[model samples]
Target: MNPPPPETSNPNKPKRQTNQLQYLLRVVLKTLWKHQFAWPFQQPVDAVKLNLPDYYKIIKTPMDMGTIKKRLENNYYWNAQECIQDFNTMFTNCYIYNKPGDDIVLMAEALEKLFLQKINELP
Candidate 1:
């Protein structure tokens, strides 16, 4: 059997901790990218290409995983909680713009749970 929940204390301790925080933060994001429903969320909405003009108006300031990774690596986020807020905000915008029954909405819902699960299981 696998080792029991090994302590992540080495990474958890030390004043050299920004790297530690970045480690867990990115791993959570990496999991988000791997989710089955992650595809569409990785990029911004193509309102013009899709020709949904009002899509631009409804959520001009959009959120996406690509930008999250950009900001993550750029050290834009001071903490993991700030990093994940955009994840939640992404879904929130989707929830408002689309019918709850819409395909993208459903995918976002599933990814939301996957995000929470990964955080729960984080070391």
Candidate 2:
């Protein structure tokens, strides 16, 4: 060979593809966290309803079961009334005892961490 070929003015396609892939990976990871940790408690409003972002907004901010499981023994509520009673008691303690300004922040943090930890445990 006499001389090497001239380089093209356009950028490297492989490198560009890699950058796109990197961005895609980050987005996928974020979505994974949002579904697993941020919106697991999200309920469907109607038969044809979808689990959209707005549904999360309508809930108690972001909404845990594992810690509740530990607290619940064989004795469990089989009726709606009893379940409501349990919910009232649990939330009353969380909201009432934590003071005013701090309670909202505390609740947010507690709920976030609780679900986040559960997501982290996945295989």
Candidate 3:
């Protein structure tokens, strides 16, 4: 009899990974206040969707609206707690504190790191 598919060889795994990647993209974008370009706790712009090309390039993935909507609707939280931790770390660091434009730049860098980390976690 033929053996079952190996875990590493499962075709569905890539689809699942892609979903997870999209989820993280949305979370990090939200966490960074993509709509407002300000701190995390500030009020965000109404219904603004972040569509950063750099993020897509880094993930080596394409935009799939159906998948993105379902994932966001389901309230998928990928490394949410960790995202907060990253924020805490970034907030506390003197590098981001008291800096005008630097704060946003550093914050963007941190979010990029989180996105890359999520990609690495995928299969």
Q: Each candidate's TM vs. the true structure? A: 0.77, 0.27, 0.27
**Regions more than 4 Å wrong, model 3:** 1-71, 74-101
User: For residues 37-120, could you state the per-residue lDDT of candidate 3 as single tens digits?
Assistant: 344323221112443323323322222223333344444324444333433443343233335466556654565465455545
lDDT of 2 at 85: 42
Residue 19 of model 1, lDDT score:
55
Model 2 accuracy (lDDT, Cα): 0.33
* Top TM-score hit: 1
Q: Give lDDT for model 1.
A: 0.70
TM-score-superior candidate, 1 or 2: 1
Q: lDDT of model 2 at residue 19? A: 30
Please give the CA lDDT of all the candidate structures. Answer: 0.70, 0.33, 0.38
Residue-by-residue lDDT tens digits, candidate 1, 24-119: 456878878988899988877767667777875677457878767766666666666666677777888888889988899899999888888777
The TM-score that candidate 1 achieves is 0.77
Worst 10 contiguous positions by lDDT, candidate 3: 1-10
